[PDB]
Design a protein around this ligand. Sequence first.
Ligand SMILES: Nc1ncnc2c1ncn2[C@@H]1O[C@H](COP(=O)(O)OP(=O)(O)CP(=O)(O)O)[C@@H](O)[C@H]1O
Ligand SMILES: [Mg+2]
Length: 278
Amino acid sequence: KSRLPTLADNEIEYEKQIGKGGFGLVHKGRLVKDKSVVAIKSLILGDSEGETEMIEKFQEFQREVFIMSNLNHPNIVKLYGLMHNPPRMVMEFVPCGDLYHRLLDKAHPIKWSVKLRLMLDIALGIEYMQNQNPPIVHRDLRSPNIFLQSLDENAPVCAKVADFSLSQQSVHSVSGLLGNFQWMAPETIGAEEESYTEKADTYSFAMILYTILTGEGPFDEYSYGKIKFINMIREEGLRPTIPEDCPPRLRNVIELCWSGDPKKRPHFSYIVKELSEL
Ligand SMILES: Nc1ncnc2c1ncn2[C@@H]1O[C@H](COP(=O)(O)OP(=O)(O)CP(=O)(O)O)[C@@H](O)[C@H]1O
Ligand SMILES: [Mg+2]
């Protein structure tokens, strides 16, 4: 973790509450120095919460700080600095919501050229993450965690990776169960203490590729009980059906990225190269 700048209450102008996070509130603001629109994420552990949930909220907030302090890439949501009383993160405001809510608008499909811009922007973000020393394992890559800067095909940045808790950056492999099984690698969801790497994010990216391509949620075509669903993904190689009209080069990238064997999941230099050829 590198140096993180501190900003006093004098250096920001609160505008409105824009959302509600896992550990507190989210506000829209302005940086008084250069008039930059910002998102302020506060850490509020109310005395209504229990012991185990309160410590999970603090460690969640701090991991996001520790990981984001080293990050500097146009396709990753940027940390401007920290605030105290209450502990707050000052983030760059990303004006066009998230990928999840945009894809729900079935009446207005994202055109093919912008879809490609989104795919590449996210891949570049994750490529940068996996090129870190040690590599960053997001552990929560899904359409709600992809923020949209612009839907214009000619924009400098269209998509940005966001929400870096539950994220890890270690010289040794990580472990732990992950909840959202429709987005997460088989080696992460099998109700055990299994070891995995950044290749779990490569699996998640394949689901992101599917959701952009189709506009649909991964695994929504199937309906199983939780235990059965996990077993099908793990042991039976259950995957979302790629439509017949998908470009052969994209289909290969998706298929390879959601391989049951994590070693067969490609390096992102290959992923970026292949996507750019679309
Ligand atoms: N950098 C940013 N730019 C623009 N809006 C942002 C933003 N950061 C947060 N928001 C807004 O605040 C809302 C609060 O959600 P947040 O960003 O805290 O994710 P979350 O912690 O709720 C994901 P989950 O709890 O499901 O793991 C978001 O839905 C978004 O609308
Ligand atoms: Mg998260």
